[PDB]
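Researcher: Here's my situation. A collaborator sent me these components and asked whether they could plausibly form a single complex. I don't have experimental data yet, so a predicted model of the whole assembly would be a useful starting point for our discussion.
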Amino acid sequence: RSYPCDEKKQVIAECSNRRLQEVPQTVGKYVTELDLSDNFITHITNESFQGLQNLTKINLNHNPNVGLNITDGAFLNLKNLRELLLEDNQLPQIPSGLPESLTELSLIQNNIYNITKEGISRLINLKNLYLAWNCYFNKVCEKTNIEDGVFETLTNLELLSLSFNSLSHVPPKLPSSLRKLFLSNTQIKYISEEDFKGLINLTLLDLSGNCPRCFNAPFPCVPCDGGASINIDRFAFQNLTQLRYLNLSSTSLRKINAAWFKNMPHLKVLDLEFNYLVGEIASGAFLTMLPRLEILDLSFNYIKGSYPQHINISRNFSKLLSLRALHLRGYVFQELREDDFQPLMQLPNLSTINLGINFIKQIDFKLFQNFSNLEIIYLSENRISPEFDPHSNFYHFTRPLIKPQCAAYGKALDLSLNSIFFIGPNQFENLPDIACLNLSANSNAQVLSGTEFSAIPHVKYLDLTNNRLDFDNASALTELSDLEVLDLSYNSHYFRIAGVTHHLEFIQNFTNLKVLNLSHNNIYTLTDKYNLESKSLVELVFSGNRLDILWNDDDNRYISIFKGLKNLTRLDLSLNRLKHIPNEAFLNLPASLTELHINDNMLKFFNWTLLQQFPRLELLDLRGNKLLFLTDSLSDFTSSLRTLLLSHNRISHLPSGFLSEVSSLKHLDLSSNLLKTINKSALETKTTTKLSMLELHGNPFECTCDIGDFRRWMDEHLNVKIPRLVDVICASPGDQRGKSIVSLEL
Amino acid sequence: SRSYPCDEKKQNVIAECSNRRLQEVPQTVGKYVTELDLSDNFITHITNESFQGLQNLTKINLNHNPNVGLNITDGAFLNLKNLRELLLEDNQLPQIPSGLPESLTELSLIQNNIYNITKEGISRLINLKNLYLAWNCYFNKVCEKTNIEDGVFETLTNLELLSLSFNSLSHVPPKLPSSLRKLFLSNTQIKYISEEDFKGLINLTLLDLSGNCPRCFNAPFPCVPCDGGASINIDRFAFQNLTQLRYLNLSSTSLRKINAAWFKNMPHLKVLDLEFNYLVGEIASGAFLTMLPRLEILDLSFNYIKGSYPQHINISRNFSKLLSLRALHLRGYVFQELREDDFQPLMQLPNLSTINLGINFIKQIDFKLFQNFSNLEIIYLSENRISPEFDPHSNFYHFTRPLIKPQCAAYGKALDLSLNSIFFIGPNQFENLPDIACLNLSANSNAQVLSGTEFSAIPHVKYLDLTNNRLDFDNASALTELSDLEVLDLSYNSHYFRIAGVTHHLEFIQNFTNLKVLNLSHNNIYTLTDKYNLESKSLVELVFSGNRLDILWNDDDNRYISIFKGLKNLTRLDLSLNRLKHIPNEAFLNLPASLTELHINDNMLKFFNWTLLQQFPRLELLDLRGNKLLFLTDSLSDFTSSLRTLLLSHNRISHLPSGFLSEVSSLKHLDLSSNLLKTINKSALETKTTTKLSMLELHGNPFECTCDIGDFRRWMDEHLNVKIPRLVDVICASPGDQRGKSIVS
Ligand SMILES: *[C@@H]1O[C@H](CO)[C@@H](O[C@@H]2O[C@H](CO)[C@@H](O[C@@H]3O[C@H](CO)[C@@H](O)[C@H](O[C@H]4O[C@H](CO)[C@@H](O)[C@H](O)[C@@H]4O)[C@@H]3O)[C@H](O)[C@H]2NC(C)=O)[C@H](O)[C@H]1NC(C)=O
Ligand SMILES: *[C@@H]1O[C@H](CO)[C@@H](O[C@@H]2O[C@H](CO)[C@@H](O[C@@H]3O[C@H](CO)[C@@H](O)[C@H](O)[C@@H]3O)[C@H](O)[C@H]2NC(C)=O)[C@H](O)[C@H]1NC(C)=O
Ligand SMILES: *[C@@H]1O[C@H](CO)[C@@H](O[C@@H]2O[C@H](CO)[C@@H](O[C@@H]3O[C@H](CO)[C@@H](O)[C@H](O)[C@@H]3O)[C@H](O)[C@H]2NC(C)=O)[C@H](O)[C@H]1NC(C)=O
Ligand SMILES: *[C@@H]1O[C@H](CO)[C@@H](O[C@@H]2O[C@H](CO)[C@@H](O[C@@H]3O[C@H](CO)[C@@H](O)[C@H](O)[C@@H]3O)[C@H](O)[C@H]2NC(C)=O)[C@H](O)[C@H]1NC(C)=O
Ligand SMILES: CCCCn1cc2c(n1)c(N)nc1ccccc12
Ligand SMILES: CCCCn1cc2c(n1)c(N)nc1ccccc12
Ligand SMILES: *[C@@H]1O[C@H](CO)[C@@H](O)[C@H](O)[C@H]1NC(C)=O
Ligand SMILES: *[C@@H]1O[C@H](CO)[C@@H](O)[C@H](O)[C@H]1NC(C)=O
Ligand SMILES: *[C@@H]1O[C@H](CO)[C@@H](O)[C@H](O)[C@H]1NC(C)=O
Ligand SMILES: *[C@@H]1O[C@H](CO)[C@@H](O)[C@H](O)[C@H]1NC(C)=O
Ligand SMILES: *[C@@H]1O[C@H](CO)[C@@H](O)[C@H](O)[C@H]1NC(C)=O
C-alpha cells in the first residue's frame, strides 16, 4: 500500500494535490513518472529525488500551491529524466544545471525574463520547449531578454513556444529542426523575410495577437500605434513549404497578401479571427491560393457599430475546393438569402457552416439544400424568429459545435438560443433530412400537437431544453416516429402551475425512443394519465422534479408512475426532495433496472429489503442524503450489486457482518460519513469477495487503540484500494487530530 | 446557569424547546415558564409525571412528536390548572385522549388518526373557545368515517370556533352551540345542506363548505366528485338565520347556479370565495350579484369551461351593483382578448382597487380600458400570452401571499406583466396607461437593446422589475427616461453578459439621481466595454452576487480595480457567490469608504487582509460566512472601532487568538459556528477589558471535551449577558465518551 502516492501500471506515482511539504521519501522502485503537482513544496535539492534514478518524468506544476526554491544541479543526477514540468512555480530564472537527457521542458507561467545559454543551450536533446506566459497583460514584469543564439544549439528542437512574453522582434538563429513555433501575443509588429527564412520543416506558425484588435477585449490589450495592422514582408513566408497551420488572429489585418501563400501548397488550417476583414471577405484574392485548405476561421471581423442587411461572400470562395469547415461567427448581419451563399454551394467537402452570434433575424432555409454534403448547420445565438488555460486555444473554445451524441445520427441543425417562440406549419420546409435538431433556449411556449415536425419527420435526437413548453396535447411530437433521444430539461414554466393541464401521454407512442430527459421540470402533478409508459425506453432522467409530492403517503395516483417503462435500465431520481420512498412505490420501479440514482435527496430511510425485487441492479447511488443505518443482511437482498455509493450521509456505525457474503460488490464508497471506527466483523467476509475499492476519506476517525483492527485489516487486504489515504484523517484525540490514520504508532 | 435545553425569553415567559431531538420532556424547565413549545422532537410518551414541577403553564405545544406514535395517559394533563391552550397536531393519535383539564380554552388535534369525537373526550371541556379537529381522514389515507357522538358539542356553550374540515362526515353534525362564530366543514363529503343544519347559529360570521361535491378535473390531490359530477345541494332557506355572515367559502362545490335567495338575509357579506365551480354562465348573468352591496372581495377563479378558449370574457352588467367591491379575482377563466367593452360594468365601482387576471392565456389587451376605473391600485396580469404538504393552517384553494411585492406596491399603482411574451417593447406598448409606479416585466423572454425611449409613456416608474429576461445591454441611455427610478432589479439577465465577444454597457447607471437599490445578481458579469466602473451619486445598495469578480479582479488585469469606487453613497454591498479565492489588496481598498455592510459570503477565500478594515471607519457588519479562511488576526482593534457583527460561520478556523474577544470593543455579534475549533484556551477568553459581545455562535465546532474546556465553561458561566444559541448543537466531538454530549453537560 503506497503512501502517500497512488500507484498504477498504465508506472505512475500520482502524488498531486495532497498538501505535501516536501518531495516524499517513500515512493516505489518501479516508478518512472512522479506527479507532484498542486502541493506545498518550496525546496528541491539533489537529495530530494536521490533514491529515484529510474524516473523519466517529473511533474511539479503548482508548487507551492499559494516560490519554488531549486538548487543548481538538483535534477542533474536523474540520468533518465526526459520530461520536466515546472509550470506555475514563481521561478525567477531558468534553473541551472538541468540534465542533458531532457527531451521535454515546460516553464510556463513563471517569472523568467532571461532566456540564457547557461540555462538552456546545454540541453541539446530538447524536442519541446515551453516558455509561454512569463510576461503579459498587466502583470508586473520586464521585457523578455533572449540571449542571442541560445536556441541554435538545440538541433533536434521541434516545438518552441514563447507566447505571452514581451519580445518585440522574432528571435534570430532558430534551429531548422522546428515543426511548430508559437509566437502569439509577443508584441511583435514587423515580420522581415529573415525571421523564418531557414525553417523549411515548419508545419505550424502562430503569430496571433501581435498588433491586436483591442476593441471590447476581455483582457488587458495594447494595440500597435493607431490600431495599425501587423506588418508582414512579402517574402516572410517564402521558405515555409510544409506549413499546414497559420494563426493570424487579432493582428488587425485589413488586407491579405495572396503572395504570402505562393509557396505554401499544403495549407490546411487558416485562422483569421478578430481582424478587420469584411472587405477582404467580399473581394479576397488570397482564396485562389488555398486550394488544399480544409478549415477557415473568419470569426469576429465585424465592423464596430455596423448591422448590415446582408453578408457579402466573394465568388472566389468557390476556389476553396478542399474546404470542410467555414467559421463566420460575429460578422453581424440581418438576413441570409439563397443568393448570398452561391459561392459556397458547389464545394464538394464543405460539411460545416458556422454562423453563430451574428444577430441574424431571418434565413431562407431552402438555400441549405442546394449544397453537396452539409452535415452541420450551426445557427446558435442569433435573432431568428417564426483565467486563460495556457494549454488551450486562446481565441475560442474547442469543444465540438454539436454534442457528438447528437451529430452521430446524421445531418444536424442547431437553432438554439434564438427567438423561435412558436413553430408554425412551414417553419421547417425546404430543409434537408435533419437527424439532429437543437431548439434549446428559444422561449418556446407552444402546445405541440403532432404536426410541427412533419417536414422533417426523421429527427432522431431532439433537444428542446430551456423552453417554456405547454404540454397540453397527447399527440405532441408523435410525427417523429424514429425518435431515439428526447431532451425536455428545464421546461418547468407550465409544470410548476397546478391549475393548467399537463399531458405526458405521447411518450408511449414512440417505438425507438431510448433516452428521455425530464430533469428540472418541477413535475408534481399531471392530468388524467398518471403513468409514464414506453416499451422501448432504456434511460429516464427525472432529476429536479417533485416525487416527494407525487409519492406523498396520502396519494396513491403516482404509485406506478415508472412501472410501465418496461425496458428501463437507468433511472435518475436525484434532487427530488425525497424524505422517504413508500414501499409500494419503490417496488413499482421497473425490475429491469441496472442503474438507480437517488442521490442529493433528503432520505432519512431506505428499505434495503426491497432490493430483492431487483435482480439486475448493479449500481445504487444514495450519495448526499441523510441515511444513518446500513442493513446488516445485504447478502440476502441482492446478488448483482457491484457499486454502492453512500458518501455524504450520516452513517455512524458499520454493522458487523455487513460484507457478510456480498460477493458481487466491488466498489463501496463511505467517504464523508460519521464513522468513528471500523471493527473486525464489519469487515469479515468468509465468502469470496470482489471488493477492490473502498472509500473512507472525510470520516471523523477515533485514533485510539480501537483503530488497530482496521489498520491491521488494511495490511491484511492490500488488494482493496483505499484512495486518498492522506485524507483518511484522525478526528480525535487532539495530538492525533490531523494525522492520517496510517501515520500512527499502534 | 443558562437555561437548557430550552431557550428562555420574555414576551407579553416563553421556553423555546423545539426541534432538538429531545427523547423526553425535560425536568430542567424553569419553574417560571408559562409557555412550553416542545414541537418537532422525539417524544413518544407523555405521563402525569412529565410536567411534574410545572403549575404555571398556560400553553403547551407538542406538535410533530415523535418526528420519524405519541402515547398519552388519562389525566396526564389535568394536574395543570392554568393550561388554556394545548397543541397536539401531527402526533399520530388514535384517540382524543382522556381527562384533559377543564381549564382548556383551545385544543388542537389536527393531523392525527381520530375517527371518534365522543362526549367522553369533549363534553366536559366547557371552557373551549377553539376546537381544531381537521385533517384526520382525507384523500387516500387508510381511514374510517368520522363518528360524531350525538350532541357532543352542545355543552360547549363557550365554543366560538369549530373546525372539522378534511374528515369524512356526510352531514353537518346537529346540536351545535349557538356561540359559534366560525365553522369549518371543507372537504367533509357533504352533498346536502339542510334547512336545519345551521338554523340556531345566529352568531356565525364565517361558514366554510368548500370541497363538498368537488370539481375534480385536473385536481392536484385525490379528488372524488359527487355522483355525475353533481353540484352541492343547498336548501333555498339554508342560510336563513345567518344574518351575521361576513365570510362564505363555497369553492369547489361544483356550482352552476347561485341562488340569489341564499343572500336574502345576509346583508353584511364581505368575502365570497367561489373558486373552482362552473360559473361561467352565472358570471355572464348573475342575479345573485344584485344581492351583495357590501361585498368587498369576490373570488371567481378557476371556473373555466374545460376545452374552451373563448374570444372574450362575459361580465354581466349586474357586476355594477357591487358598490363595495375592493378586489375581484378572475384567474383561470381562460379567454383570448380583453376588450374595452368587456369590463364596462366594473368601471364605475368606486373602491375596486385590485383586478386579478392571472393565468387566462390572454393574448391581446386593450390597455386604455384601465384608465376608466375609479381607483385601481393593482393590475395583476401575470402568466398569460401578452406579446408586443398542504399546510393545515393555510388556505387550501390558493396561496395567501400578496400579488405584488409590498416594497414595489408601496410606491403606488402597480402593473404586473411577469411571465408573458412581451419579448420586445415597441413604440406604443404602454400608451394610455395610468401613472404606473411599479412595473413588473420579469420572465418575458425580452432580448432587446433598451435605448432610453421604451418607458417614455410611463416616465414615473419608481420600482422596475426586469428579472429573468435576456436583456441586451448595448446602449448607455437605457432606462434614462425614468428620472424618478429608485429601485431596479436586473437579476438573471445573464444571456448576453456570458458572451465575451458581444458589447456590454452599464454606463446608464450614473444617470439616475434618485436610484437607491440596484440588483445585478446572477448575471455572470465578467467583462464590459469601454467603461469598466460603476458610478452613481445616489445608490445606497448594490447586489452583485453571482457574477465573476474572480475574473474582473484576476491578478494580471488592472482594469476593474476601482469597479465600485464611483458609487459614492453606497452603504450595502453584496459580493457573494463570485468564486473569489482572494481579493487583491488594492481592489479591496477601492471599495466605498461609506460602507456600513459588506457581504463576501460563499466564495472560496483562503486569506483576508484584516489590516485593510482600517479604511472603512463606518463598516458595521462583515459577512465572511462560507469561505475557507484559516486565519484570524490577533490585532483586530488595531484595525476597527466600528464593527458590530462579524459572521464567520462555515470556515476553517481551529484557533482563536489570545485576547480575541474583548479585542472586539464595538463587536456585539460574533458567529464562529461550523469551524474547526477544538477549544477556547484561557488566552482566547483572557480579554484585557470586558467584552461588549451579546451574541456568540459556536455550534457545530469539533470541541474537545476534556478538563481542557473547563476554562471556557467558567467563561460561559460568568458571562450570562452573552447569549449562545443552540447549546444542544454546541457539542463534544471528542473524546468518546463523549461525542454528542453538549459541552453544557
Ligand atoms: C375558505 O375561506 C376562508 C376565508 O374566508 C378560509 O378561512 C381562513 O382560513 C385560514 C386557515 O387556513 C385562517 O388562517 C389562519 O388564521 C390563524 C389565526 O388568525 C393564524 O394563526 C394562521 O396563521 C398560522 O399559520 C400561518 C401560516 O401557516 C402563520 O403566519 C402563523 O405563524 C400561524 O401559526 C392562519 O393565518 C383564516 O383566519 C381563515 N379566515 C378567517 C376570516 O377566519 C378557509 O381557509 C377557506 N377554506 C379552505 C379549505 O381553503
Ligand atoms: C492559433 O492556432 C494554432 C493552430 O490551430 C493553435 O495551435 C493549437 O494550440 C493548442 C493549444 O495551444 C494545442 O492544444 C494542446 O496541444 C496538445 C496536443 O498535442 C494537447 O496535449 C493539449 O491538451 C492541448 O490540446 C494544439 O495542439 C495546437 N494545434 C496544433 C496543430 O499544434 C494555437 O493555440 C492558436 N493560438 C492561440 C493563442 O490561440
Ligand atoms: C439529459 O439526460 C441525458 C442522458 O443522460 C444527458 O445526456 C447524456 O449526458 C452524459 C454526460 O453527462 C453523456 O455521458 C457521457 O458520454 C461521453 C462520451 O460517450 C463520456 O465521455 C462521458 O464520460 C459520459 O459517459 C451521455 O452520452 C449523454 N447521452 C446522450 C444520449 O446524449 C443530457 O446531457 C441531459 N440533459 C441536460 C440538459 O442535462
Ligand atoms: C435584488 O436585491 C434587492 C435588494 O436587496 C432585493 O429586494 C430586497 O429583498 C430583501 C429580502 O432579501 C428585502 O428585505 C426583506 O424585507 C422584508 C420587508 O421588510 C422583511 O420582512 C425582511 O426582514 C427583509 O428585510 C428588502 O426589502 C428588499 N428591497 C427592496 C427594495 O425590495 C430583491 O429580492 C433581489 N431580487 C432577487 C430576484 O433576488
Ligand atoms: C386555467 C387552465 C385550465 C385548463 N387549461 C386550459 C389551458 C391549459 N390548461 C393549458 N395547459 N394550456 C392552454 C393553452 C391555451 C388555452 C388554454 C389552455
Ligand atoms: C459579434 C458582435 C460584435 C459587437 N456587437 C454587435 C452587437 C452587440 N455587440 C450587441 N450586444 N447587440 C447587438 C444587437 C444587434 C446587432 C448587433 C449587436
Ligand atoms: C474531399 O474529401 C475526401 C475525403 O472524404 C477526399 O478524399 C477528397 O480528396 C476531397 N476532395 C476535394 C475536392 O478536396
Ligand atoms: C444545444 O444548444 C445548447 C446551447 O447552445 C447546448 O448547451 C447543447 O449542448 C446543444 N445540444 C446539442 C444536442 O448539441
Ligand atoms: C429494449 O431495449 C433494447 C436495448 O437494450 C432494444 O434492443 C430492444 O429493442 C428494446 N425492447 C423493446 C421491446 O423495444
Ligand atoms: C414579478 O413577477 C415575478 C414572477 O411572478 C415574482 O416572483 C416577482 O416577485 C414579482 N416582482 C415584484 C416586484 O413584485
Ligand atoms: C445618499 O443616500 C441617502 C439615503 O438614501 C440620501 O438621503 C441622499 O440623498 C443620498 N445622497 C445623494 C448625493 O444622492
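Model: Some features of this prediction you could bring to your collaborator: Residues A 321-322, 348-349 surround 2-acetamido-2-deoxy-beta-D-glucopyranose (ligand 7) (CB under 6 Å). The two ends of chain A are 17 Å apart (CA to CA).
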